[PDB]
A paper describes a structure:
We provide an important correlation of a genome‐based mutation to a molecular phenotype across two predominant clinical Mtb lineages of the Indian subcontinent. We have identified a distinct lineage specific mutation‐G247C, translating into an alanine‐proline conversion in the papA2 gene of Indo‐oceanic lineage 1 (L1) Mtb strains, and restoration of cell wall sulfolipids by simple genetic complementation of papA2 from lineage 3 (L3) or from H37Rv (lineage 4‐L4) attributed the loss of this glycolipid to this specific mutation in Indo‐Oceanic L1 Mtb.
The investigation of structure of Mtb PapA2 revealed a distinct nonribosomal peptide synthetase (NRPS) C domain conformation with an unconventional presence of a zinc binding motif. Surprisingly, the A83P mutation did not map to either the catalytic center in the N‐terminal subdomain or any of the substrate‐binding region of the protein. On the contrary, the inherent ability of mutant PapA2 to form insoluble aggregates and molecular simulations with the wild‐type/mutant (Wt/mut) PapA2 purports an important role for the surface associated 83rd residue in protein conformation. This study demonstrates the importance of a critical structural residue in the papA2 protein of Mtb and helps establish a link between observed genomic alteration and its molecular consequence in the successful human pathogen Mtb.
Author numbering:
A (entry chain B), B (entry chain A): 2 to 459
The structure:
C-alpha cells in the first residue's frame, strides 16, 4: 500500500533483532555444485545490469523491502521457525550466480535445502541511519541476498524483509503474508506449522522459458511484432515522452505518489470502461495515453507494461521473477476516452501472448539490418495492479500497516505503478531526481488524474 | 520402415497370445472418479470426430498399429511384466473420456494405477482375418483402448501393438523400443527391470495448454497469423491441389509408397540445401512446392505439416499426443531450388512457434466477420521425418523388422510422409481409394521425385 523512500523511513526506537545466514550455511553455499538450469531472462538481464553498475562505481537498485507492524512482544523462536521455513521452501533461495571468464552466467544450487539456515542476533547499538544502510546491503552476486528482522519496541514490534529482486516479484507480498504472518500467528497461537501446498519450482520455469525462446526465430510472428514495436520507437523500447534532464549524471530515484480516484469515482470509472467495451485496465492505459496527448499533442502512445506470466496452478504457487513485458500502443487521434479505452484494451489483451517473449531474445535474433538496440536511460515502464481482488486485497484490506520502501538508488527510467484498491486508486512514479524530470512527471500525473476524474464524472 | 494396409497383412501362422484388461481392471476403471484435467485440444478434436463418425454410421481411423519380429520363444512372464509396467507408467493410460448430457467431454482418472492390469489369453483357432479385425477394434471411447500381443511361431514370434491415437503419437515407437524390447532383454537375461527416468505426465500438458490458449485473443499475433493463412486458403486449411473423387461416399484409405533417393543422393541433397541457405526439411517442402508448380502452375504452395510440440525435458519423457500443425507457405514464381528451399526453411522454422496454437482455438476466437469455418473433406497434410538421427534410427537400424500398419478405414484427406533413413529417402501417401485420387497422387509423386533427383545430381 504505502510506498516511501528508505531514507525517509524513521523506525520506532527499539531492539533490532536480525537474521543472517549462519557460517555453516555460507560454507555449504560456497561449495554448491554447478547447475545446468540457466538464469531466467529476467535474472540474466538483472545480473548483467548489476555487474555493469558495479563496474561503473554505481549503486544499483536491486531489492524489494517490506515492513509491517505487530502488537506486543515478538516470539523469537516462532519467528525464527517461520523465516527459516520460508527460505527452505522456495528454490529461488537455493541458487546463486556468478560470471565466469567472458560474460557467461553460471548457476550454483545447494543440493540439500536443510543446509540453509539463518540465525538471529541483536544489532546492539545500531542507530536508525545504520539500520537504513544495513537493510539495503543485500546484492544479487551473494547467495544470502536477503535480510529479515524485527524492531522490538516496548509494546509493539515491526517486521522487516529485504529480498533481492533476483529471487522474487510482487507475488512475494502475498507469500510473505502467509508464510511469515499467518505461520507466526499459528505458532504463537499454539498450533503446529500451517500446512501448505507444495511450492512450485522456479528452476522449471527457467528451463521451459529457454526451451520456448529457443523455438523462436527472427521471422516468428511474435518476434516480428516486437521488432515492429521497437522500430516504431527508434529501434528500442519507448522513452518517456517528456524531458527528464541530463541522465548522464547519476541522480537517485525519487518517488511521487498521488491518489487518482476515491471509491465512488472508481466504480463510475469502471462503468465508463464497460460502456466503452473495455475494462478497468484498458481505461488505465487510455488515461496514460490521453495524458501524453494533452501535454505533447501526440497521435499515438507507446509504452511497455509489466505483467505476471504465471499461468498454471504450479506457477501460481511459484516464488520468483515471472514479470514479462507487454508492448502497449494506443492511437489517440480522436482524443475521446471511449475509443482510446477500446483500442488500449485490445492492445493489452492481445499483447499478453507477447509477454513471454523476452525482448533480450529479440535482440539476440535481430541482425544489423533489423536496426534494433537496447534502450538508453529514460525508458518508460508502466504497471497496473488490481489490489482490490487479488490476494493483495487480503494484505491491503488487513489491519497490518503493510509498507513498501524504495531504496532510493540511482534511477535511469520512469516507472509508473497504477494501483487499484478497495477504496481508492493511486499512482506512484519512480524517476530521476532532478528539477526537469520532477516538473515533467508532476505535469504528466496532474493531467492523467484530471482525465481519470473527467471520465468518472461524465 | 514398411507401411502396409492392415487388410494386406498376412501374419505367420502361430499361436496368438493376446493381453486384455482384466474384468476387475475394467470394472474399477468404470467407476473411476471425474478429473478436472481436460482432454488436450488434440484429444478433444479426435473425440468429437469419432463421436460424429459413429453417429453418421462411419468407421473412423483412430489407431497406431505396429509390429516387430523376435527370434525364438517368447517369455510370457517377462512380456507380461513389460506390458503391464508400460501401462502403469504413463498417465495417458489412466484416463478415459465420455460425453455428458451436454457436449462436454468429461475425463475420468483411475486413482491407483496399480489397479490397471492386462492378462494374456490364447485366441485359439483365431484366423488371420479374425486377427486383423480384432487388432483394429480399439476405439477412443473405451478406457482399455489398446491391444498388445504376440504371434508365436515354431522358432520366432511377432510382437504387435495397437494403441488408440488418443493416447500416443509417433514418439511411442521409441518408448516401446525401450519399455518392451529393452525391458524384455533385461528380464530374460535375469536382470531386474531396467531403470527408467521419471515419466512425464500428460495431464500437466493438458492443463498448461488450456492456460496458454486461454491467454490468446482474436487479435493476438499468432492467432492473426493462423487466420491469415486460412483466409489465404479460402477460409480453411489447405486443400489438396488436385481433384479427388466423390467424398460423400465412404471409400477407405489407400497407400502409395515410393523411393526418392539413395544414400549418396541424400548426402548430396543435404549439401545442396546447406549451400542454398536451407536444410533438408526446407528442401523437402521446396520439392513438394516445386512439384506442385510443374503440375498446376500455381503461384504459391500452402500446406500444413506436423511437428512435435514437446520442449522441456519432462515433455520429452511424456507419452501422449503432442503433435501440432505448422502452416507452410512457399512462393514458387522463380522455379529455382535455392530460393524455394530458403523461403520454405524460413516458413517451417518460424512456424514452429505457431504449432502450439491449436486451430480449434482459432475457430473459437474467430467471428463471422473473420470468415472462417472448420475444414471440409480433402485437406492436405505433410510430414518430414528424419529417421537417421531420431530414436527411429535405432529401430530403423535394428535387426527387427519393424512395421507400421494403416487400419484402412475411411479417408477424407491426403496425408504425405517424407522419411529420410540412413540409406534412402522415401515417401508414403494415404488418400481416398478411388481412381481419380489415385491418378492425381501418382502424378504428384512422380514430379516430386524427379525434382529430388535433379537437385541431388545434375
Ligand atoms: Zn542484520
Ligand atoms: Zn485379443
Amino acid at each position: 500500500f504505502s510506498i516511501t523512500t528508505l531514507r525517509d523511513w524513521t523506525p520506532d526506537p527499539g531492539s533490532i533483532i536480525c537474521w543472517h545466514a549462519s557460517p555453516t550455511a555460507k560454507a555449504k553455499a560456497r561449495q554448491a555444485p554447478i547447475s545446468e538450469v540457466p538464469p531466467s531472462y529476467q535474472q540474466a538481464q538483472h545480473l548483467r545490469r548489476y555487474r555493469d553498475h558495479v563496474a561503473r562505481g554505481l549503486d544499483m537498485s536491486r531489492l524489494m523491502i517490506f515492513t509491517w507492524d505487530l502488537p506486543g512482544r515478538c516470539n523469537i523462536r516462532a519467528m525464527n521457525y517461520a523465516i527459516n521455513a520460508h527460505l527452505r521452501r522456495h528454490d529461488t533461495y537455493h541458487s546463486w550466480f556468478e560470471f565466469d571468464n567472458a560474460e557467461h552466467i553460471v548457476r550454483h544450487t545447494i543440493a540439500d535445502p536443510a543446509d540453509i539456515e539463518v540465525v538471529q542476533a541483536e544489532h546492539q547499538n545500531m542507530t536508525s541511519a545504520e539500520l537504513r544502510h544495513h537493510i539495503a546491503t543485500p546484492q544479487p552476486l551473494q547467495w544470502d541476498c536477503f535480510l529479515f528482522g524485527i524492531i522490538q519496541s516496548d509494546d509493539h514490534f515491526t517486521f522487516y524483509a529485504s529480498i533481492a529482486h533476483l529471487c522474487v516479484d510482487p507475488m512475494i507480498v502475498g507469500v510473505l503474508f502467509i508464510e511469515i504472518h499467518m505461520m507466526y500467528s499459528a505458532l504463537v497461537g499454539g498450533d503446529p506449522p500451517i500446512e501448505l501446498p507444495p511450492a512450485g519450482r522456479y528452476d522449471d520455469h527457467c528451463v521451459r522459458q529457454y526451451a520456448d525462446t529457443a523455438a523462436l526465430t527472427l521471422d516468428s510472428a511474435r518476434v516480428r511484432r516486437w521488432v515492429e514495436f521497437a522500430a516504431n520507437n527508434d529501434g528500442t523500447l519507448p522513452h518517456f515522452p517528456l524531458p527528464l534532464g541530463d541522465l548522464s549524471v547519476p541522480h537517485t530515484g525519487k518517488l511521487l505518489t498521488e491518489t487518482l480516484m476515491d471509491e465512488q469515482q472508481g466504480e463510475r470509472f469502471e462503468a465508463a470502461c464497460v460502456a466503452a467495451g473495455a475494462r478497468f485496465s484498458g481505461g488505465v492505459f487510455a488515461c496514460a495515453a490521453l495524458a501524453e496527448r494533452e501535454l505533447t499533442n501526440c497521435e499515438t502512445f507507446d509504452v511497455v507494461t509489466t505483467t505476471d506470466t504465471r499461468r498454471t496452478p504450479t506457477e501460481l504457487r511459484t516464488t520468483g521473477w515471472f514479470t514479462g513485458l507487454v508492448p502497449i500502443t494506443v492511437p489517440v487521434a480522436s482524443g475521446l476516452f471511449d475509443s482510446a479505452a477500446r483500442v488500449a484494451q485490445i492492445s493489452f489483451d492481445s499483447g499478453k501472448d507477447l509477454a513471454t517473449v523476452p525482448f533480450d531474445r529479440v535482440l539476440e535474433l535481430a541482425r544489423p539490418e533489423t536496426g534494433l538496440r537496447p534502450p538508453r536511460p529514460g525508458n518508460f515502464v508502466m504497471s497496473f495492479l488490481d489490489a482490490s481482488i487479488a490476494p493483495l486485497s487480503t494484505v491491503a484490506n488487513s489491519d497490518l500497516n503493510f509498507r513498501i520502501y524504495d531504496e532510493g538508488r540511482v534511477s535511469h527510467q520512469v516507472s509508473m505503478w497504477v494501483n487499484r484498491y478497495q477504496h481508492q486508486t493511486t499512482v506512484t512514479v519512480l524517476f530521476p531526481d532532478n528539477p526537469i524530470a520532477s516538473e515533467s512527471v508532476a505535469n504528466y500525473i496532474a493531467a492523467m488524474k484530471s482525465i481519470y476524474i473527467r471520465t468518472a464524472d461524465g
